[PDB]
Design a protein around this ligand. Sequence first.
Ligand SMILES: *[C@@H]1O[C@H](CO)[C@@H](O)[C@H](O)[C@H]1NC(C)=O
Lengths: 51, 51
Amino acid sequence: LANPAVPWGQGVEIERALKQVQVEGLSGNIKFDQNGKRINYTINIMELKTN
Amino acid sequence: NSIQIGGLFPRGADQEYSAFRVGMVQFSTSEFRLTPHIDNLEVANSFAVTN
Ligand SMILES: *[C@@H]1O[C@H](CO)[C@@H](O)[C@H](O)[C@H]1NC(C)=O
């Protein structure tokens, strides 16, 4: 809260580090854009039947 | 009999603070007097508002 707030430099580097990550996981292929939203995801379209 | 009251005016609000001061002038009384501390901020910013 201390004013004026001062951010640490390393943070940006950690951010870039996270955003550049591309891995395989339970949600399928995991990759991010510059803003941090998910990219190249696969959403299985499913229907409920009798069985 | 001093009453401290804070205030928050979004940057770019002029006539509002004007009407605030005019209100301070008109409703001033011998019994008690409001002592405003005004803080201009980015109202859309949650951090700024919290701080
Ligand atoms: C991954 O996402 C980008 C962003 O739209 C898209 O252009 C690209 O074709 C995607 N790749 C696959 C294999 O869907």
